[PDB]
Specification:
The structure is cut from a larger assembly and holds six copies of chain A and three copies of chain C (124 residues). Chain A is of the alpha+beta class and 274 residues long. Chain A contains seven helices and 13 strands. Chain A has helices at residues 10-15, 20-44, 59-71, 109-116, 119-131, 171-175, 189-196, and strands at residues 2-6, 51-53, 87-88, 101-102, 104-108, 145-146, 149-155, 201-207, 212-216, 221-228, 233-239, 242-246, 266-272. In chain A, strands 2-13-8-5-7-6 form a six-stranded mixed beta sheet. A three-stranded antiparallel beta sheet of chain A has the order 1-11-10, with helices on one face. Chain A starts with a strand and ends with a strand. In chain C, the strands form three sheets. In chain C, strands 2, 4, 7, 8 and 10 form a five-stranded antiparallel beta sheet that branches. In chain C, a hairpin with a 7-residue loop joins strand 5 (50-55) and strand 6 (63-68). The relative contact order of chain C is 0.43. With 124 residues, chain C is mainly beta. Classes of the chains: A alpha+beta (274), C mainly beta (124). Strand 6 (59-60) of chain D pairs antiparallel with strand 3 (39-41) of chain I, so a sheet runs across the interface. It is classed as virus. The entry lists the keywords capsid, phage, phage head, cryoem.
Chain lengths: 274, 48, 124, 83, 47, 124, 124, 145, 48
């Protein structure tokens, strides 16, 4: 995938005092950054095997999610399998080791606020202040950590920048970023909202180790073509090939396991935003 | 922000917006979908 | 006098063999400027219809835009189209048996002339 | 038509004075040689010019009225018939 | 044909005053997503 | 979604003066994708037909594809064509006398829009 | 077999909102080879006509070439045109009131496919 | 173009403004664009590294008093004290920071010194310092009231 | 007249009206009759 810009005639370019190559390269670097990030996010929040849904995020639901990941449970307690942690340390509380586990939680900004305007979160932040554990998080307006798992405000998906998606993203504008060769099924936030509406929303994720697999080159190539319109114009293009896929691990033989059509290390976190 | 201008004429600062364009996929030539670089500007006039 | 125009144009030609089924003939990008769709029947059919229309890459959004009975053996869509998520030109043949009256199989050829979404600025 | 109201074809000449018209912009026309057409088999040569041509006709920078204001600086028309 | 009344005009409308446009165009993009920190080559990375 | 499309297109315009004879208007390559043939009569004919069709570069393989009587003065072929050794578009006027009703000679203009046989691969 | 052909082609697409007035849709250069003009009505009009035609850049040289009543909602010019000083494609709607039967405003889209006056020499 | 009105300056409104700046919402929580920050730094939440935005929020001194008399402001100051965050602000009478953004007591606009305007500033007086060549429209504080 | 200007910006040719005011005489000081410097301007935009 890639994008390009073609300039005005050199007379016009130096008339309006634009250095087309420089500005175009900068703008295309920004575009490609946002595009690869949207690739990762769209693959991440694609069809969800297990997702929790609370009408507003709270440490209740974060704890439930870290819970289901740590022991491998589904929303209806279908008991799939435990999600591998980002980091799995082991410490003894009194005299017994317990193997505490760490994950990552990517929260939509509306979800990050719903968590901020959440009572139990307020008392948790108060307790961290008393202990002096998450120091630098109330000062900085961040979300600190919960149950050893960092909670991250990823952002909002829009035209301008990448962030955690939501049900206002159109179906086409979401499927643009799915490989369609690395995904077996498509479930967009429109479709997910219709799904959980059978019994506007905003998507977040709980992420374990190797939740999303990137194959290929992370590097980006630029192409500068000064010889357009005999030379009056130049064309600047930017291109990269990269395979993104949410780890799914179908099978090898016909044997059925609890891993087959299951997101290896992702739990969905749906919540109303407005 | 200070915009020290030699000859102290009226100034015209400019910004460029995001590239909100779906590019080209695969072997498709760049040119099958060109993006557009939009520039925004405003004029600052002096006062004595 | 100054405007923006589409300067890039492609033609896609695809053949299918005129018996019952659904075929995905032409793929179009979002914002494509479809300006000609033409369908042609090479051979002598005896019974059946061909319906060309638009459908999604995945979901079942088929809707015929040009229907061709046996007799006229050629048709062109009367309307012009900007591609808005209906990125498949598709053709379905609901009624058809073997070639008929010829012994040689009946062909259908679809040609799609469309302009790419890219624009350039020109003044005259 | 203006002369007709105040059918014969007319021909236009002029008495001109100093700085009758003003050629703003460089005198350097630019040439573009692209020997890359057809994979380099063919060449394309283009010429381009940015040129501001304006008949000298100045405007007052304030509300003061001047004889020079809104008048051709150094041009007087001379119109005859085509014969 | 009123002569020398109050003007009521800005410093614009003064044709003696010429406009200058800035060479430096400033990008309106500043946000940076966290995913680069998540992404890594180790087996224990989120991406 | 991936395909091969024709990315190169030409238009050939040729005039003849609308009196009895055969004219070789447009030359087409093998594999050309002829997508529009249009014939126009500039003037007021009084009697005659114009038949445009395809013929070989050398041998006598003429076959009319569009016939135009006097009255309508304009026509377009209803069919699309892939050039298979019939590499001449030709027009013949079998009946025609002097201009008629005008005093100024009657023109015929043929425009042929065709896509070159070359293809490129694109996915959308 | 050798000829000169037009190798450059543009498509201009312009929308207007289908109520009384005159709109200058497409600008064409001198010597342009206008090979397709198509007009489309998006919505459900209740009363009115749309007339597309050619007019000068300045002077009042308007002359309709395609008239569209309410019912058919789509049309294409039956004739091909070489631009000779009539360098504006224009459309006028003399009768029209508010949208009608829909509540959503009625659109008209005009697409003009034309070949540039430039020619190149090719032999086949 | 974008302004929030509250009957008093509480920490809720300050943080709401920070949120609208960071994420880019209009005063009717419609999407405009993320306001560029005074500073943008990288801070590690656990192993993750995110980007934090520091704005400058200039408060009229009436608003600075209204904020000092805010229960939530006192809770936040207590928490800052417990955590050992920005210190010597209540002691030295300042307002500290909120969501990484310094809160400034600017002053009151009077004939003597400069500060943030009131609805008491005359339209003529307020316009006297507007160029009127650098504005699209004039909305003086009385007009805003 | 050729007005070669760097940067090829739209130019602002500019002239003065000739001073047609009676000056001062004898001991009368200048300020008793100041002369007016009247300026006239035109803008030349480029054409490509």
């Amino acid at each position: 995938f890639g994008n390009s810009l073609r300039s005005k005639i050199k007379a016009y370019s130096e008339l309006e005092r634009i250095d087309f190559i420089k500005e175009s390269v900068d703008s295309l670097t920004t575009w490609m950054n946002e595009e690869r990030d949207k690739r990762i996010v769209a693959s991440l929040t694609n069809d969800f095997t297990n997702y929790l849904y609370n009408a507003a995020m709270n440490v209740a639901t974060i704890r439930k999610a870290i819970f289901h990941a740590r022991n491998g449970l589904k929303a209806d307690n279908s008991k799939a399998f435990p999600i591998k942690p980002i980091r799995a340390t082991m410490q003894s509380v009194g005299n017994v080791v317990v193997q505490n586990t760490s994950y990552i939680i990517l929260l939509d900004s509306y979800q990050a606020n719903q968590l901020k305007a959440d009572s139990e979160f307020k008392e948790l932040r108060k307790l961290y202040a008393f202990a002096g554990e998450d120091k630098g998080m109330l000062y900085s307006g961040l979300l600190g950590v919960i149950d050893n798992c960092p909670v991250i405000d990823a952002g909002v998906w829009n035209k301008l920048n990448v962030g955690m998606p939501n049900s206002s993203i159109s179906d086409s504008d979401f499927t643009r970023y799915l490989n369609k060769a690395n995904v077996s099924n498509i479930v967009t936030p429109m479709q997910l909202k219709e799904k959980l509406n059978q019994e506007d929303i905003s998507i977040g994720c709980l992420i374990g180790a190797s939740a999303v697999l990137l194959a290929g080159s992370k590097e980006t190539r630029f192409y500068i073509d000064e010889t357009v319109d005999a030379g009056r114009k130049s064309l600047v293009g930017v291109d990269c090939l990269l395979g993104v896929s949410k780890a799914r691990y179908q099978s090898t033989d016909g044997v059925v396991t609890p891993y087959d059509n299951q997101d290896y290390a992702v739990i969905g976190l749906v919540s109303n935003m407005e | 922000r200070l915009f020290s201008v030699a000859s102290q004429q009226p100034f015209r600062p400019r910004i460029k917006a995001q590239l909100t364009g779906s590019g080209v996929s695969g072997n498709t030539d760049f040119e099958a979908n060109y993006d557009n670089l939009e520039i925004l500007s405003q004029t600052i006039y002096p006062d004595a | 006098m100054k405007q923006k125009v589409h300067s890039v144009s492609y033609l896609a030609k695809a053949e299918f063999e005129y018996k019952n089924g659904v075929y995905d003939l032409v793929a179009l990008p979002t914002g494509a400027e479809v300006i000609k769709i033409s369908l042609e029947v090479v051979g002598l059919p005896t019974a059946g219809h061909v319906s060309v229309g638009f459908k999604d890459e995945s979901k079942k959004n088929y809707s015929s835009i040009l229907t061709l009975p046996v007799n006229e053996t050629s048709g062109v869509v009367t309307k012009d189209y900007t591609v808005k998520s209906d990125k498949i030109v598709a053709a379905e043949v609901k009624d058809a048996l073997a070639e008929g009256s010829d012994g040689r199989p009946v062909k259908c050829v679809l040609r799609a002339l469309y302009f790419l979404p890219s624009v350039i600025e020109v003044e005259y | 038509e203006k002369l007709n109201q105040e059918n014969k074809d007319i021909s236009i000449g002029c008495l001109i004075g100093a700085s009758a018209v003003l050629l703003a912009g460089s005198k350097e026309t630019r040439f573009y040689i692209d020997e890359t057409v057809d994979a380099g088999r063919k060449s394309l040569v283009g010429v381009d010019c940015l040129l501001g041509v304006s008949k000298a006709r100045y405007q007052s920078t304030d509300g003061v009225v001047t004889p020079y204001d809104n008048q051709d600086y150094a041009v007087i028309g001379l119109v005859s018939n085509m014969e | 044909e009123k002569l020398n009344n109050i003007n009521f005009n800005n410093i614009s409308n003064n044709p003696n005053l010429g406009i200058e446009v800035g060479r430096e165009i400033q990008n309106a993009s500043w946000v940076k997503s966290p995913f680069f920190s998540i992404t890594g080559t180790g087996a224990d990375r989120g991406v």
